[PDB]
Paper text:
In mitochondria, F1Fo ATP synthase resides in the crista membrane where it is known to form dimers, which can further assemble into rows critical for inducing the membrane curvature and maintaining membrane potential and morphology. Here, we investigate the mechanism for the generation of the unique cristae in the Apicomplexa, using a combination of single-particle cryo-EM, cryo-ET and subtomogram averaging.
The IF1-arrested structure, in which ATP synthases are locked in a single rotational state, allowed us to obtain a map of the rotor-stator interface at 3.5 Å, resolving both the c-ring and H5-6 of subunit-a, where proton transfer occurs. In addition, unlike in the canonical six-helix (H1-6a) fold, which is conserved in bacteria, chloroplasts and other mitochondria, the subunit-a in T. gondii lacks H1-4a, and only the horizontal H5a and H6a are found. Mechanistically, the essential arginine on H5a (Arg166 in T. gondii) is thought to be responsible for deprotonation of the conserved glutamate on the c-ring (Glu150 in T. gondii). Our structure indicates that in the open conformation Glu150 is within 2.3 Å distance from the juxtaposed Arg166, allowing the formation of a salt bridge. The rotor-stator interface surrounding the Arg166/Glu150 pair is more hydrophobic compared to other structures, with subunits a and c contributing a total of eight aromatic residue side chains. Thus, the tight hydrophobic interface between the decameric c-ring and subunit-a in T. gondii is consistent with a direct, rather than water-mediated Arg/Glu interaction. This is mediated by the short N-terminal amphipathic helix of ATPTG11 (Ala9-Leu17), which is sequence-conserved in Apicomplexa.
Numbering used by the authors:
A (entry chain g2): 67 to 271
B (entry chain H2), C (entry chain Q2), D (entry chain P2), E (entry chain O2), F (entry chain N2), G (entry chain I2), ...: 96 to 166
L (entry chain e2): 1 to 65
M (entry chain Q): 7 to 18
N (entry chain d2): 41 to 183
O (entry chain K): 151 to 219
The structure:
Amino acid sequence: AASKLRMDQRRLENGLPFATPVQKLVQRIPVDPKEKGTLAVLALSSDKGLCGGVNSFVAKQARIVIKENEMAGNAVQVYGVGDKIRSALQRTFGDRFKRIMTEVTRFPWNFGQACIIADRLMQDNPARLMVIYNHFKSAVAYDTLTLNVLTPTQAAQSAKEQLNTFEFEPEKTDVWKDLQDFYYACTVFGCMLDNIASEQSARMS
Amino acid sequence: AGVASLSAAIALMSVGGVAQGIGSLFAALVSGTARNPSIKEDLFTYTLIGMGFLEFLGIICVLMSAVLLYS
Amino acid sequence: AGVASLSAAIALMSVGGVAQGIGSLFAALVSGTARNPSIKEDLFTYTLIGMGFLEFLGIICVLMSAVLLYS
Amino acid sequence: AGVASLSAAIALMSVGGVAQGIGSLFAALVSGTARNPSIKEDLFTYTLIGMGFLEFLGIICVLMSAVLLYS
Amino acid sequence: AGVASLSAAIALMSVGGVAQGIGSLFAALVSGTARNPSIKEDLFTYTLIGMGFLEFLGIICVLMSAVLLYS
Amino acid sequence: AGVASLSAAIALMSVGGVAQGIGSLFAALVSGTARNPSIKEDLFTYTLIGMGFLEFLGIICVLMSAVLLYS
Amino acid sequence: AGVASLSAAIALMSVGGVAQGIGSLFAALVSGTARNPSIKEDLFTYTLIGMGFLEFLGIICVLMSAVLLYS
Amino acid sequence: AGVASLSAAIALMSVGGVAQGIGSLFAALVSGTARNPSIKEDLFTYTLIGMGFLEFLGIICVLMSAVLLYS
Amino acid sequence: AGVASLSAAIALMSVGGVAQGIGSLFAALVSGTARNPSIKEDLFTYTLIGMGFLEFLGIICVLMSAVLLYS
Amino acid sequence: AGVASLSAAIALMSVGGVAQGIGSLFAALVSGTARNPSIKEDLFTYTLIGMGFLEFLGIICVLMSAVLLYS
Amino acid sequence: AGVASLSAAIALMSVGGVAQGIGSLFAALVSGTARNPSIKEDLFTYTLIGMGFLEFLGIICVLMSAVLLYS
Amino acid sequence: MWRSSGVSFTRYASEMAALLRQCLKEPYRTQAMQRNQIHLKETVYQQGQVLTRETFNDIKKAFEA
Amino acid sequence: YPASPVQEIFLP
Amino acid sequence: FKNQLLLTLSSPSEAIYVRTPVRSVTVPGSEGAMTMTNGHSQTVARLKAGEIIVRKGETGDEVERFFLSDGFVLFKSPEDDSGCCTAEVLGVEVVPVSMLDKESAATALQELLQQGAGATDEWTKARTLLGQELLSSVIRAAP
Amino acid sequence: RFYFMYMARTTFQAVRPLLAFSVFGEVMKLVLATMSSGLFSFLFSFVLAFEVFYFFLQCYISYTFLTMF
């Protein structure tokens, strides 16, 4: 599998510079995770086994986050990538799903498989979003994370005074609706690439 | 003295510029409010201040007419 | 005393500077409404303020005409 | 019979001031549809209000020209 | 060949404004087309409405011009 | 001497507005072309329409000048 | 016989341009305000500078107009 | 007879608007190039077209001035 | 009196275009500041150069007025 | 030659429109160069081309003035 | 010098226009500098050329006035 | 444009990159169309009780739904 | 009043 | 470091530059083209199509073309010290020009107009038009 | 004062079609009585179709406004 790992490291170092900038731009707007509203988790995962317990750690974090956001009274919805997350939550939190995806990595990772999922979210516009994944620190260790994400409803409640340093060639109100979508796509891109690399590094245990 | 009427009319043939200025003001107000409603409470103030000049000008452009009409 | 009937028209020539103001104003109203519809209720309001002065100016250009036509 | 004509022909210059302003209004309406076709209406009404006011101004200028022609 | 000719020529100083209004209209049309072809025949429609007033106004001038040349 | 000459020239000072309208119109075309270089026949068509109307008004002004000259 | 008043008026016609200039100033001001309030005051400052010239010009006009109405 | 010179000089006041139009047009070209210097030519073409019409206007104005002068 | 004072006021009618120029200029100053304040003072300079020309014209006009009123 | 001098002075008012044209032209040049310096030189030529036309207007006005001055 | 005075006073209504022109120029420059400061100099150079031509015009009109004040 | 047609920006971007890739040369076009394959299996839920499971081999049929 | 059509009206 | 333009030109699949120093860049914004150098203002812009053009400090006159379908650009000012101004050009599909053709372009154009003859839906018509634009751009930008 | 403004508007929007139906017709009658060719009469027939569209457009505008009253 080391070969696949070389390929995935290459895709990261050749697909991260793409995503990083717009995300580090739009994160200039602070996101209050304790905000209220219809949550929407995108718990990423794998599709096979032999990956250690990375999916276990993902599902653990998701269980905790949901048991939290439900005691606070916020409705919940669970999006996913992979049948492992399904098998790991279909019984405990099977009443909350809204959409799930599989057979993703049968073919190499691309931008289309991310644009599609981003569109499914936009069309299913929730008030607040969240993403979970396994950042690929080193070839022998990873780090699970939870990215909060800026949704249109969190944006409309902000005059966006943090970006006024920037000059948007089309006016802000004419470019924001396309920049948020690019942001979602780049987000999913980076998260899944890191998840894949972590999965593979585990498989080579 | 029929000329005084002509002069009073002439002196009154310049509120058009005043009106075009006011139009520019409130157009930019409305626009700048479309791009940022949260700040209306300031976009208004400054607008008023601008008028605080035009109006004055306008008054002159009116006042003097009467003068030029009698004297 | 035909000069009176001249001063009247020389005064009404101003309205061409008022109509352009109103036009630009409502153009900005429309365009702004094409970006942030959810706040039309404010735009129109502010717009009215503008007209609330423009028309007044226009009225003068008419009123004084009559004056310059009789007195 | 020699001055009234001049007065009328002079009052018919506000019209070139008006056509400008109507052109801008409808140009802004057009571009507004080009930016957000989902709302053609909710613009046509505001456009129509502005155009009513401008048509009133045009009526004033024409009417007073006719007056000064017959007076 | 007296003053009535002068008046009928002065009454053709308004056509400038009409032409400028029409230019603004069709320029905004061309722009909103280059920006959204899918709705050409919508824009055009609204464009025509504007003409219904401008053309009209312009014609009035011309007509009134003759009215003064053959008082 | 030839007051008809003055009437002609006066009636022939309106081509400025016509020319300005034409320029603005063709400017929008060129802009709209630079932005959408594949959509040109439609822009050219609408341009030619507006130019027909403008040339009509300009020909009116010129012919009326000549008339007032050879009155 | 009252040419002094005529000259005073012909002087007080220029105020239109001054009003238009002031309007463009404060329009850009509220615009720049809507686009970057964190610098708001600075803009105000610079704006005033321009006024300090326009008004000056304006003053002269009115001042000079008086000089003519009394000579 | 010195009036013919008056009428001529008056007839030439249109060249101003003509040049203004040509300026707007060439500004549109100079921009369209920067915005899209792949073409540089189709824009030049439509430019020459518009200048064809504008040159016709300027030329008839000049010739009419010389006419009204010599007569 | 009449002719000289008339010429003075006439010459002093060219103080409006100057104000319009200054308005456009400081408006662009304000806008270019709002878009990029880190070079604020490197823009002010240029506007001053503008005065160095515009103001002169203004001054000159004013000057000539007095000359026309004392010659 | 009083009336000849008035004819000259009235002819020069073509200038004032020419200047606005050249201003818009070189302004579009300046801007389109701040955007895309890679093409600077090209833009220049185009302006010159346009300038050509405008120049062959300016002098004419001036020249006609002289013509109308020396009868 | 009764009428030469009016001829001069009329010769200086172009200046206004010129001013406008200049204004526009510098406006553009300023903006095209708030965008890409590293390209001041180039812009400046081009800008001068504009002013150059404009000043010529300016100069011309002023000088003609003096001529029309003596001749 | 697309906004008025009830459409997202990513749809436009992808459906135009498709044409761009179709306008390429073979030694690189085959590579591209290899690295840009698509195979999804979308599944929907509603309190459990699946409403549908649909496979997606191409971009257009994926976005249309 | 050489400009009889115009001069006569005002300032005769 | 130095006072150069640190370009980074990125596609999802192959980053061609990361922090490469250059003198001048051209990018086809939505309004129109725009050229980026040092000193330029913090800006963002959407792209629509066209041939990015890069010119290096060691080249000056030697250039590098790169076609682009859609995407964004983000020009950020230097850190307080580095003196180096950074530019991100994010293109969903960045292509060099040696790897383009005119025959397949015309063929896809005809295919698109055929698919668009059945113009009933909004997205179909918009797609037809935008494709016309992109393919014209390719043809004019192609060898 | 308002009542005068509104009756003026009403009367203008009531006569707007009457003009395009009567005075434009008189103008065209003048052209016909002055000219006799056919080619110029061909452009004239085109322009008459245009004036028909114009009358229908003015009718639409007056109807719209009156509906707004």
